[PDB]
Amino acid sequence: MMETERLVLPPPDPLDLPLRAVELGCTGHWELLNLPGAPESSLPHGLPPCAPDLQQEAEQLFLSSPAWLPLHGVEHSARKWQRKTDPWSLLAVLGAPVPSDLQAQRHPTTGQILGYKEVLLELNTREEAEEEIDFEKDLLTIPPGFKKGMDFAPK
C-alpha cells in the first residue's frame, strides 16, 4: 500500500482486445477469454476431498476395536448338534370321497329344475352288509412278492 490511487484511461486503444485469463484444473492448463471481467477461475477452492488420507484410514482399520480379530469370528466355537430320526412321521393316511352329489331334478317335459335332491354315488353290529371279519383268528403274515414276513408276539 504505497500509491493509494491509480488513474488510467479505460478505452485505451479500441482496436486491441482485453485479456481474460481462465484456469481449468490443477494440472497447468490456461486459456483466454475475450470480454473483460473477473479472473473467473474454475474450481476456486480446489478439488473436492475424496476418501480419507492413508494414516487415519489404517488406524481405524486396525485400532478401532478388537472385533476384527479372528478371535471373535463366526468360527472358533466348534459347536455340535444331535440327530434324532423319527421314521414314524412317514405314515400316510388318505381320506375317503363324499358318496353324494345333490343332483337336480327335471320335469320330464320342457325340463325345469324343480329342486335339488341328494342321492348316493355308486359294537352295534348292523345286519345291512357286515360279514363278520375276524382280526385275531388267522393273521396273514406274508407280503406279496417277498419270501418271509415277521412274527410279532400276540397281545
Binding site: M1, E31, P44, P49, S77, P87, F152
Partner: protein
C-alpha cells in the same frame, strides 16, 4: 332338408340320452343344434350329454354358449361354474358363485361350492407350509358351511364337508389356530366363539357323528375313525395326558373295524386300519402288517401300503427287507415322497456316501418335515468340519448346489411348522449368521433362549446365551448384550471374551482390560493367546497409555511364533504416533516370514502409509505402481492407485483416469470407488481430451451417483463437475446450463454425512468445502440474496470461524465493486483484516489482490500476489505457485498496456515469465512475453519471429493462437507484406476463425 325339424331331433335325442346310448344322443343333439343354433335348451342338453360320458371341455364350451344368452337362469350359470371348477381354476369359480349369491341368497349349492373351493385352496396351502393362509381359509369355509346349514339341515353332504373342513387342521402347530366359529355348530346359537385346536377337533368329531347318524355309509365311518385318531394324536403329543386316551383309541379302532367289515374290498379302509393299529398307544403290529398285506392284495396299484410296510420293517431293524419294500413302492410310483425319505434314512443308517444327495432330492421334491431336518443337519455338520475344503464333497455340494440358502429356506418352513424344538432354532441361527442376516439370527437365538430356560442348562443353555449375547453385541444394543452376558457362569474362555468385547464397545475400558486379563490367565491354543494380547493392547491404547500397549505387543512378538495379526496392529500403532521407527522394523519383520496372507491390499496400504508419514509424498504412488505391476489382477490395487494419484502427486491425471477405468472394467462391485476416483481425476485434468461427449467428468460422476447414492463424496464431486462444466461452456459461449441446484446438493451432502460412523476430520473438511463451494457458486450464478442468508444462518448457529466470515465479505462486496464505485479506506482495512486473520489459504490472498486491482492498487496487488506466491511455495503446493505467478505477470502486463512511465513493470513481467517457463511450458506465459516485446520496441524482426513461432507450431490452445494471430496480423500489416498477409489468411482458413479475417477486411480498405 336343412334344419327346421328341431322338435323331432330333440325328442329322439332325449330318448337316446335317457337310455345308455350316449353316442346316438350326442349325434342327435348336435343335429338339433345344427337345426337352430340359438336355443339354449339344446346347448344345455348337449352339454349334459357330453358330461354324462367322458367329455368335459366340449360340454364346458357348450354350457358356456347356452349360458351366454338368457343370463337370468341360475341353473345354467351354476353348471358353467361347476364345470370350470372341476378342472381347477378355483378363484374364477369363487367369483361366479359370489355373483350368484349376490343375485340369489338362498341358493344352497352356491354356498356348498364356495365352501368346497375354500377348503381345496386350504389343502393346497397346507401342501406348502403357508399355515396362516390355511387357517384363514378354513375359518372362512366354516363360515360358509354353517350359513349353508342354516337353510337345509337335513342333508348329509353339508355336515360331512363341514367336518372335513374343521378336522383337516391337524399338525398346524397349536397356538396358531384360533377359529371364529359362529351359530348352530356350538349347540345353542349365541353370537360367536373363538376355538383353539382341541375344541376344533372335538367339533369335527361331533359333526361327523351327526352326519353319520342320518346316513350310515362306509366312507363316513372311516373318516370318523381317522378323526378320532387325530384327536388322540394331538392329546398325546402335547403331553396333556396318558392312559386316559385308551377309550378314545378303542373307539377309533371300533369305527375303522366297522368300516372295513362293512365293505372289505377297498384298499383305503385297510390302509387306514393298518396305520392306526400301529400307533404307539396301541402297538399291535401283527394286525397292522396283516392290514397292509390285505390292502396290497385288494388293489395292486398301491404305493401307500408298500411304503407303510417299509416304514414298519425299517423301524423294527429290518433294513434290507424294508429297502426291498421301498424299492417296490417307488417302482409303482416314481414321484411319491415318503419312499424317497425312507430310502434316505436307510442310506444314513448303513452309513453310505449319498445320504446328503438323497436328502437334497427329497427337499427339492415336496418339502416334507423329516427330510427337511435331515438335510439341514447334514449341511450344518458339513460346514463345521474344517478339514473338508478341498474334498470335492464340501466344494461340489456347498459351493455348486447352493446348499446354504436352500437349507435356510427349508429350516424356516420347518420351524414354522413345529416351533417347539431348540436345535432347529440354533441351526437356523447358525446358517443366518453365515448369510450375514444378523438380525434374523439374533431373533432365532432369542427364541432358542426362550424355549430352553427350563432345560438341564449345563451345555444347552449357557452356549445359547453366549451365542445370543455375542450376536446381539455384533449389531448395536450393547446394554442388552452386557445384561445377557451377566446371566451366565463366566468360567469359560468364550463367555469371558464376549463379555469383554461388549464392555469395550460400550466403553468402560478398564473393565474390558480386567476381563481380558482374566481370560488371558486361562489360555491354551496359543493363537488365542496372541489374539488376547493384541486385544489387550488395543483396548488399553484407547485410554491412552500407549507405551504399555507397545511393550505388550513386543512381548507378544517374543512368543515362539508371530500370528500376522499382532504385527499389523503394531505397525498401525506406530503410525498413530509420529515415531515412524518401530513401524519400519515391524513391516520388514512382517514381510520376512509371512506369505500365507491372501489380502495383498493391506500390505500395500501399510507400506504406502509408512512412506507418507515421512513426508516423501511421491514414492507413495511409485510404490503402489510397483505393487500393481506385481499382481496385474486384483482390481482393488488399481482402484487404490487411482485414489493415491488423485490425492498425492496430482500431475499424472491421465494415468489415474486410465487406472480407475481399468479397475472398473475388471469387476462390477468395485464400480463405486473407482468411478469416484476417475471422476475426480478428470476434474483435476481439465479438458485435455478430444472434446468427446459421453466421457466427461459429469458423466462418470453421474454413473457413480447412480451406483451408490449413499456416500458424501459423490455429491460434492457433482457440485464441482457442474461448476467446471459451467466455466467451460462459458468459454465456448454456447449456453450456461445446470444453473441453480447447489442448495439441494448441499442438503444431500450434509444428510449423507450424518449417518457415517467416524472419519471426523474427513467429514469436517468435506462439510466446510461443500459450504464454501455452494456459496461461491451462488455468488457466481447471481443469487446473492440466498448466499447472504445462508452465511448469516451459519454464523447464527455458532460463534465466528474465520472461514465463513470471509465468505460473507465476498457475498457483501459483489454488487459494489462490480459496477465502478469508489471505496473508503475503512472498508479496505476491514477486508484486509479479515483476510489476514484467515491466512495460510492462498485463494483468499489472491481474491484480495484482485479487489485491489479492480479498485486500482497495482503495487499493493503485486505485493499481495508476491506474499501468496511465497505462502504457496512454502507449503510445497504446485498449482497455486504457477497460478499466482501467471496472475502477477498479467497484472504487470496490464499496467504496462497504458504505456506508463517508471519502466519497472517490464522487468517484473520478464522475471515472472522466466520463472513460469522454468516450472513448465505455459503457453499463456510465452504469449505474455510476446505481448511485452510487442509493446516495447514494437519493431520488425525479432517480435515477428517470436509471434510466428507462437502462432505456427501446433499443440496450442485455440484462444491463445487466435490472440497471437491477431497481433501478428496487425504487426505484419504495419510493416507491409501482402504475401505474408495472404499466408496468414490461408492459415486462418485452414482453422476456424471469425475475427482475424474480419480485422483483415477492416484494414484492407483503410
Amino acid at each position: 332338408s336343412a334344419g327346421t325339424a328341431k322338435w323331432a331331433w330333440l325328442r329322439r335325442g332325449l330318448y337316446y340320452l335317457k337310455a345308455g346310448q350316449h353316442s346316438q344322443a350326442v349325434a342327435d343333439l348336435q343335429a338339433a343344434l345344427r337345426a337352430d343354433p340359438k336355443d339354449f335348451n339344446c346347448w344345455e342338453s348337449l352339454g349334459e350329454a357330453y358330461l354324462s360320458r367322458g367329455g368335459y371341455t366340449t360340454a364346458l364350451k357348450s354350457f358356456t354358449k347356452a349360458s351366454e344368452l338368457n343370463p337370468e337362469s341360475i341353473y345354467s350359470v351354476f353348471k358353467v361354474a361347476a364345470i370350470q371348477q372341476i378342472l381347477g381354476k378355483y378363484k374364477e369359480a369363487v367369483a361366479q358363485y359370489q355373483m350368484i349369491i349376490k343375485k340369489k341368497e338362498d341358493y344352497v349349492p352356491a354356498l356348498k361350492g364356495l365352501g368346497e373351493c375354500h377348503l381345496m385352496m386350504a389343502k393346497a396351502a397346507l401342501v406348502d407350509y403357508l399355515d396362516g393362509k390355511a387357517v384363514d381359509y378354513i375359518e372362512k369355509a366354516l363360515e360358509y358351511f354353517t350359513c349353508a346349514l342354516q337353510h337345509r339341515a337335513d342333508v348329509s353332504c353339508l355336515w360331512k364337508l363341514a367336518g372335513d373342513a374343521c378336522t383337516c387342521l391337524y399338525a398346524v402347530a397349536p397356538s396358531k389356530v384360533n377359529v371364529h366359529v359362529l351359530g348352530v355348530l356350538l349347540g345353542q346359537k349365541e353370537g360367536k366363539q373363538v376355538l383353539k385346536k382341541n375344541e376344533l377337533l372335538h367339533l369335527g368329531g361331533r359333526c361327523y357323528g351327526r352326519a353319520l347318524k342320518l346316513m350310515s355309509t362306509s366312507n363316513t365311518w372311516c373318516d370318523l375313525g381317522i378323526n378320532y385318531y387325530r384327536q388322540a394324536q394331538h392329546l398325546a403329543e402335547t403331553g396333556s395326558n396318558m392312559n386316559d386316551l385308551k377309550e378314545l383309541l378303542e373307539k377309533s379302532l371300533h369305527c375303522l373295524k366297522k368300516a372295513v367289515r362293512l365293505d372289505s374290498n377297498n384298499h383305503l379302509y385297510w390302509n387306514a386300519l393298518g396305520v392306526v393299529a400301529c400307533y404307539s398307544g396301541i402297538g399291535n403290529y401283527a394286525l397292522a402288517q396283516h392290514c397292509f398285506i390285505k390292502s396290497i392284495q385288494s388293489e395292486q396299484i398301491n404305493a401307500v401300503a408298500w411304503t407303510n410296510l417299509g416304514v414298519l420293517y425299517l423301524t423294527n431293524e429290518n433294513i434290507e427287507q424294508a429297502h426291498e419294500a421301498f424299492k417296490m413302492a417307488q417302482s409303482l410310483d416314481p414321484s411319491y415322497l415318503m419312499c424317497w425319505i425312507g430310502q434316505a434314512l436307510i442310506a444314513e443308517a448303513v452309513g453310505s456316501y449319498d445320504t446328503m444327495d438323497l436328502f437334497r432330492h427329497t427337499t427339492e421334491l415336496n418339502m416334507h418335515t423329516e427330510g427337511a431336518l435331515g438335510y439341514a443337519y447334514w449341511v450344518c455338520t458339513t460346514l463345521q468340519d474344517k478339514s473338508n475344503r478341498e474334498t470335492e464333497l464340501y466344494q461340489y455340494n456347498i459351493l455348486q448346489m447352493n446348499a446354504i440358502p436352500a437349507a435356510q429356506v427349508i429350516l424356516n418352513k420347518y420351524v414354522e411348522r413345529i416351533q417347539n424344538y431348540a436345535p432347529a432354532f440354533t441351526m437356523l441361527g447358525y446358517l443366518n449368521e453365515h448369510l450375514q442376516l444378523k438380525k434374523e439370527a439374533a431373533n432365532a437365538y432369542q427364541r432358542a433362549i426362550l424355549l430352553l430356560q427350563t432345560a438341564e442348562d449345563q451345555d444347552t443353555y449357557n452356549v445359547a446365551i453366549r451365542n445370543y449375547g455375542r450376536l446381539l453385541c455384533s449389531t448395536g444394543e450393547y446394554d442388552k448384550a452386557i445384561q445377557a452376558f451377566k446371566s451366565t457362569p463366566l468360567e469359560v474362555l468364550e463367555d469371558i471374551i464376549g463379555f469383554a468385547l461388549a464392555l469395550f464397545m460400550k466403553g468402560l475400558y478398564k473393565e474390558s482390560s480386567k476381563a481380558y486379563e482374566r481370560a488371558l490367565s486361562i489360555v491354551e491354543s496359543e493363537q488365542d493367546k496372541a489374539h488376547i494380547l493384541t486385544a489387550l493392547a488395543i483396548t488399553e491404547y484407547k485410554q491412552g497409555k500407549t507405551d504399555v500397549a507397545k511393550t505388550l505387543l513386543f512381548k507378544c512378538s517374543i512368543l515362539k511364533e508371530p500370528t500376522t495379526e499382532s504385527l499389523q496392529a503394531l505397525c498401525a500403532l506406530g503410525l498413530a504416533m509420529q515415531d515412524a521407527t518401530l513401524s519400519k522394523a515391524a513391516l520388514n519383520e512382517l514381510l520376512k516370514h509371512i506369505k500365507h496372507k491372501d489380502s495383498n491390499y493391506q500390505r500395500c496400504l501399510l507400506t504406502s502409509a509408512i512412506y507418507a508419514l515421512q513426508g516423501r509424498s511421491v514414492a507413495v504412488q511409485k510404490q503402489i505402481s510397483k505393487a500393481v505391476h506385481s499382481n496385474p489382477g486384483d482390481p482393488a490395487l488399481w482402484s487404490l492407485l487411482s485414489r493415491v494419484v488423485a490425492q498425492y502427486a496430482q500431475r499424472n491425471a491421465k494415468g489415474g483416469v486410465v487406472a480407475g477405468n481399468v479397475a472398473h472394467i475388471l469387476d462390477s462391485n468395485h464400480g463405486k470407488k473407482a468411478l469416484l476416483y476417475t471422476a475426480v481425476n478428470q476434474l483435476a485434468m481439465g479438458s485435455s481430451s478430444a472434446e468427446d461427449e459421453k466421457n466427461t467428468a459429469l458423466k462418470t460422476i453421474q454413473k457413480a451417483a447412480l451406483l451408490s447414492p449413499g456416500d458424501p463424496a459423490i455429491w460434492a464431486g457433482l457440485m464441482a463437475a457442474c461448476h467446471a462444466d459451467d466455466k467451460l461452456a462459458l468459454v465456448n459461449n454456447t449456453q450456461p446450463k445446470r444453473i441453480d441446484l447447489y442448495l439441494a446438493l448441499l442438503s444431500a451432502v450434509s444428510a449423507s454425512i450424518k449417518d457415517e460412523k467416524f472419519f471426523e476430520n474427513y467429514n469436517q473438511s468435506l462439510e466446510k468445502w461443500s459450504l464454501s463451494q455452494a456459496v461461491t457458486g451462488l455468488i457466481d450464478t447471481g443469487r446473492i440474496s440466498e448466499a447472504e442468508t445462508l452465511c448469516t444462518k451459519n454464523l447464527k448457529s455458532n460463534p465466528d470461524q474465520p472461514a465463513v466470515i470471509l465468505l460473507l465479505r465476498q457475498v457483501q462486496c459483489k454488487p459494489l465493486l462490480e459496477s465502478q464505485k469508489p471505496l473508503p479506506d475503512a472498508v479496505l482495512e476491514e477486508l484486509q483484516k479479515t483476510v489476514m486473520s484467515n491466512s495460510t489459504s492462498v485463494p483468499a490472498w489472491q481474491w484480495l489482490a484482485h479487489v485491489y486491482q479492480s479498485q486500482g492498487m497495482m503495487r499493493a496487488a503485486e505485493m499481495c500476489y508476491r506474499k501468496s506466491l511465497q505462502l504457496a511455495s512454502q507449503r510445497g503446493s504446485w498449482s497455486g505457485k504457477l497460478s499466482s505467478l501467471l496472475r502477477l505477470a498479467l497484472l504487470a502486463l496490464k499496467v504496462c498496456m497504458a504505456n506508463i512511465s517508471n519502466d519497472h513493470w517490464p522487468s517484473l513481467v520478464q522475471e515472472a515469465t522466466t520463472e513460469a517457463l522454468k516450472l513448465c511450458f505455459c503457453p499463456l506465459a510465452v504469449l505474455l512475453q510476446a505481448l511485452l516485446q510487442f509493446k516495447r520496441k514494437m519493431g520488425a524482426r525479432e517480435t515477428r519471429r517470436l509471434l510466428e513461432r507462437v502462432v505456427y507450431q501446433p499443440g496450442y490452445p485455440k484462444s491463445i493462437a487466435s490472440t497471437a494471430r491477431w497481433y501478428l496480423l496487425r504487426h505484419l500489416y504495419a510493416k507491409d507484406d501482402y504475401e505474408l498477409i495472404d499466408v496468414l489468411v490461408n492459415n486462418a482458413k485452414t482453422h476456424g476463425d471469425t475475427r482475424a479475417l474480419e480485422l483483415n477486411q477492416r484494414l484492407s480498405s483503410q
